[PDB]
């Protein structure tokens with residue numbers, strides 16, 4: 001899944 | 007190790023299999039963002055927002071269609087890397103198709119966050135060619151499914167969604183790389199950002215980016231090199247250190263009209 005780190 | 011040593015490697019043709027990672031930084035100098043109703047910028051690639059209001063995304067779709075924007079020095083540099091038979095693969099986060107336009111073939115590309123070349127009805131999941139919605143998107147209309155009236159979303163990876171399976175080419179590309187080029191990304195988005203760790207420990211990693219990002223800041227290896235500052239500037243300074251400035255300029259204003 002495409003996610004931001006923060 | 008330094009930017010001069012990396013340039014000497016390429017010139018000697020010591021680096022036969024260059025893997026490149028690019029993000030939004032390389033497409034800003036062409037005038038692409040990252041006039042909308044966005045609560046925050048990231049919401050353009052978020053599903054809860056998209057279903058609430060699809061229009062800001064479809065504004066960007068209409069913008070990003072071929073013609074409006076031109077590839078810049080960064081793209082054309084990667085085109086020289088392919089022309090000289092040096093590019094193993096280009097991994098991109100961008101959805102603006104500028105790599106294709108610059109001359110990089112589909113086989114040398116991994117559009118890791120998807121493409122406008124095709125679309126899917128968000129409801130019944132019928133597949134569409136990306137030209138089958140062009141008229142609608144151009145006419146400021148939200149594309150709807152002929153079979154169920156659901157919004158027809160282009161195959162762009164939204165947050166929370168799996169990346170296309172072509173991404174799996176990284177398993178064979180990264181272990182095979184003799185040089186890694188990270189250009190114009192702050193390595194914020196996963197799982198793309200993690201690929202920097204996938205090259206072998208003895209492999210040079212060149213970050214041409216605004217600031218010291220990702221694994222180069224946190225756990226740096228000895229053969230890592232950062233050329234911090236503006237991306238275009240950084241590229242040109244490598245091009246100059248290679249001897250390709252004339253060949254580049256010949257390529258650039260050749261590729262306009």
Ligand SMILES: C[C@H](CCCC(C)(C)C)[C@H]1CC[C@@H]2[C@@H]3C[C@H](OS(=O)(=O)O)[C@H]4C[C@H](OS(=O)(=O)O)[C@@H](OS(=O)(=O)O)C[C@]4(C)[C@H]3CC[C@@]21C
Pocket residue numbers: 169170171172173174175177178
């Ligand atoms: C398993 C090995 C990895 C081998 C590496 C080894 C040698 C280390 C094991 C994979 C490497 C890439 C390759 C391809 C890449 C293809 O993309 S393409 O290039 O844009 O067509 C894929 C196209 C489709 O993916 S999707 O996300 O867009 O829906 C999907 O097909 S569909 O179900 O019929 O639609 C699956 C694909 C055919 C995958 C399958 C895995 C792979 C064989």
Ligand SMILES: [Zn+2]
Pocket residue numbers: 127128129130131132151152153154155156
């Ligand atoms: Zn449908």
